[PDB]
Amino acid sequence: MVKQIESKTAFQEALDAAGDKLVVVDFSATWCGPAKMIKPFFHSLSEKYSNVIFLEVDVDDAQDVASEAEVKATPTFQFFKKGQKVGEFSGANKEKLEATINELV
């Protein structure tokens, strides 16, 4: 299902509890429209891909996660698996989430 990260502590725990399924992270700003404007897609895949783990991060209130990931543009899609990174891509591209997930699925 989906899982919100409020601090770096929940970040690592998210990957550990994410099991071995894919893990896509949405680095969108809650106060920014253009970023949150794409949540109806990323979060929607939650019901279309119940076999995938989706996370959420606040690049403004969780600068700790964005700092470690050095995010400089939102939304930033980052893919993790077993606590390891396998791919990543930013830019409003909700349709790409489909091809990317089916790729490293």
């Binding site: 606040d58 690049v59 600068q63 939102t74 409003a92």
Partner: peptide, 13 residues
């Protein structure tokens, strides 16, 4: 305040 860098969502085009 909660501000950081630019949001290149559907803002580019």
């Amino acid at each position: 305040f909660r501000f950081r860098y630019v949001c290149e969502g559907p803002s580019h085009g």
